[PDB]
Amino acid sequence: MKELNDLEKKYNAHIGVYALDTKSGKEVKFNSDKRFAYASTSHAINSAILLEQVPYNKLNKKVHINKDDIVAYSPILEKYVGKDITLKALIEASMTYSDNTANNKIIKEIGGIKKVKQRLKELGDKVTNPVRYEIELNYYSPKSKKDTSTPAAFGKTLNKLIANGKLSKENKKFLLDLMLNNKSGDTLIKDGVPKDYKVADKSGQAITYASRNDVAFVYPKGQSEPIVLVIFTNKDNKSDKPNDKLISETAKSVMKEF
């Protein structure tokens, strides 16, 4: 982890890494028990929990969207005020466009923040701590645990929900294809891993402390089992700007371990 220490020194940043090859069980950890704001990488978790309870063939069920649901940065859902949207389109908006209104509506469908924390506990995750909806969950403070998790607890939860969970084959493919085709993560994990690798990711950026994250299921050439990879990073000052090359370079070093 001498390359990771050096990357912190090089980017003047803090890095939290958890990587699990689900084939061998091999793990690479660096500051894996340190808390970081997960930001919108949480959209992946909420989407998976809902998909555990709605069969693929029923993803056509619609939900009404009204003015009260709209929150900042909802490029798709702002067009749906007073209209109905299917659960499938909500999930696509939330993952592909990081639409915040879609994610909150998904949390509501699941039953609220309370029901999400319940399911995390059932999965054995007592670390991930959702308290707020979007976009307030992005107001991160080092002195608060609100909406934070550690790279290991978040990585183990993604593994249990998606890589080795109870989702059907269709739902799992559906979610993963959204993650594979998302362009917002191109400068992140996808930029650092080799060209033979498929990267299904969900990026995130909080409002404060240059909180820049990327979680992904990486598929090396020849392996069909994904390597779960969670990279959370932040800086020491509230208004610091993040450098994505930090995550691209982190993914590259970590991949050398597999």
UniProtKB/Swiss-Prot annotation:
Question: What's the encoding gene here?
Answer: blaZ
Q: Which Pfam families match?
A: Beta-lactamase2, LPAM_1
Active site (catalytic residues): S40
Question: Recorded GO terms, molecular function?
Answer: beta-lactamase activity
Q: Which reaction does it catalyse?
A: a beta-lactam + H2O = a substituted beta-amino acid
Q: Which processes are annotated in GO (biological process)?
A: beta-lactam antibiotic catabolic process; response to antibiotic
Name the InterPro entries on file.
Beta-lactam/transpept-like (IPR012338), Beta-lactam_cat (IPR045155), Beta-lactam_class-A (IPR000871), Beta-lactam_class-A_AS (IPR023650), Membr_lipoprot_lipid_attach_CS (IPR012640)
Query: What does the record's miscellaneous section state?
Result: The class A beta-lactamase family has a specific amino-acid numbering system, sometimes called Ambler or ABL numbering and often misspelt as Amber. A multiple sequence alignment was used to derive a consensus sequence and then the consensus was numbered taking into account insertions and deletions. This allows use of identical numbers, e.g. for active site residues, despite differences in protein length. UniProt always uses natural numbering of residues, hence there appear to be differences in numbering between this entry and some papers.
State the UniProt keywords alphabetically.
Answer: Antibiotic resistance, Hydrolase, Plasmid, Signal, Transposable element
Question: Hey, which family's this protein in?
Answer: Belongs to the class-A beta-lactamase family.
EC number(s)? 3.5.2.6
Q: Give binding positions for substrate.
A: K202, S203, G204
| Xref: SUPFAM superfamilies | beta-lactamase/transpeptidase-like (SSF56601)
What's the protein here called?
Answer: Beta-lactamase
Source domain of life: Bacteria
